[PDB]
Amino acid sequence: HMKNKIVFAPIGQGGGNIVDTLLGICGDYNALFINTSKKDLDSLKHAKHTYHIPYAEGCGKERKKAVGYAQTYYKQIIAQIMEKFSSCDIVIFVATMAGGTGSGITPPILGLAKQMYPNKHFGFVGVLPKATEDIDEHMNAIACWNDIMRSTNEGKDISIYLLDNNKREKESDINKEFATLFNDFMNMSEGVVDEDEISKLLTMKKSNVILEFDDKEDIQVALAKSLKESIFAEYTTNTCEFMGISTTRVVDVEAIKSIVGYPRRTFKGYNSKKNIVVATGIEPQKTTVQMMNEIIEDKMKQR
Numbered sequence: 673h674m675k676n677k678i679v680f681a682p683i684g685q686g687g688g689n690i691v692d693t694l695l696g697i698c699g700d701y702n703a704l705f706i707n708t709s710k711k712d713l714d715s716l717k718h719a720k721h722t723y724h725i726p727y728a729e730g731c732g733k734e735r736k737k738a739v740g741y742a743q744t745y746y747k748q749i750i751a752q753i754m755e756k757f758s759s760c761d762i763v764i765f766v767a768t769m770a771g772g773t774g775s776g777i778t779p780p781i782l783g784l785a786k787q788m789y790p791n792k793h794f795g796f797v798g799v800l801p802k803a804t805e806d807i808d809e810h811m812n813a814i815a816c817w818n819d820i821m822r823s824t825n826e827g828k829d830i831s832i833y834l835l836d837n838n839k840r841e842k843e844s845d846i847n848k849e850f851a852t853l854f855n856d857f858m859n860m861s862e863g864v865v866d867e868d869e870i871s872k873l874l875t876m877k878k879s880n881v882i883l884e885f886d887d888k889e890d891i892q893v894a895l896a897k898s899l900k901e902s903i904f905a906e907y908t909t910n911t912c913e914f915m916g917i918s919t920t921r922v923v924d925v926e927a928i929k930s931i932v933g934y935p936r937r938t939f940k941g942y943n944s945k946k947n948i949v950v951a952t953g954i955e956p957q958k959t960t961v962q963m964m965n966e967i968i969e970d971k972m973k974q975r
């Protein structure tokens with residue numbers, strides 16, 4: 673259905689882990705696993721389709737060697753995706769940003785795919801490193817972000833799911849939680865948020881965030897705890913474009929808007945299992961990303 677409309681393009685070990693985790697939850701998705709490391713690809717649990725960059729191996733967080741291996745295979749990689757999954761409207765790229773092949777190869781491949789196939793929708797799921805990681809790791813994530821900004825009109829051309837490894841102790845938890853959040857998002861159509869409404873949310877440009885909250889505490893309090901604990905990178909703006917809401921019981925939607933952010937269009941529905949809010953079209957969290965430059969400059973001066 674909506675899930676078969678989506679094809680993931682995980683690039684690198686971390687991005688491969690996330691999509692693999694998601695497929696473990698639900699195999700209704702499509703994915704082409706891209707990596708310089710044949711080892712990582714062979715070690716995947718649920719990869720039916722993989723693409724090993726020829727004559728390549730793991731790049732040990734060196735993004736310019738990743739490009740070295742990949743640059744000549746960019747088009748065929750895109751050929752693989754678009755012609756094997758020709759009936760997929762939405763191509764979501766998934767990559768960690770501090771790595772070598774995820775960080776260095778995703779922005780050229782994404783940017784090129786945009787130009788070759790203009791009428792498909794493109795998403796980017798990126799993962800910000802922990803603050804304790806070193807200069808190179810942060811320099812890689814800055815370079816990754818900037819390459820995508822420069823290739824997508826500052827995030828305006830694509831959907832952005834921005835994740836923060838600082839928000840959890842284990843990277844695996846980030847993997848599990850996002851995989852859960854995205855699939856719950858996709859299952860909102862089970863008064864219901866319809867598929868076209870889910871489609872609108874999913875394909876909305878700029879930065880998207882998915883939130884779930886409990887029905888114990890007050891809803892303003894309950895959403896506040898979700899925002900604070902969100903695996904997504906923090907946003908400082910107070911508006912968004914489209915908002916999806918699917919809850920177990922009747923809720924004050926305006927309270928949700930005051931806490932999560934004010935949308936110009938809302939889709940509301942009900943489900944029997946989760947209380948989920950999706951904010952889409954949030955301005956790309958450049959402020960949160962800018963902090964990496966602060967880490968770089970503070971770690972640099974330590975030397």
Ligand SMILES: Nc1nc2c(ncn2[C@@H]2O[C@H](COP(=O)(O)OP(=O)(O)O)[C@@H](O)[C@H]2O)c(=O)[nH]1
Pocket residue numbers: 683684685686687689690731732733768769770771772773774775799800801802805809837843844846847
């Ligand atoms: N959330 C999450 N982050 C990861 C994972 N693996 C790696 N990372 C992050 O990405 C960086 C290493 O990227 P990795 O994907 O292993 O390198 P790549 O294969 O060259 O893209 C580390 O600094 C981590 O911050 C993962 O499985 N989950």
Ligand code: NA
Pocket residue numbers: 697698855859
């Ligand atoms: Na499912």
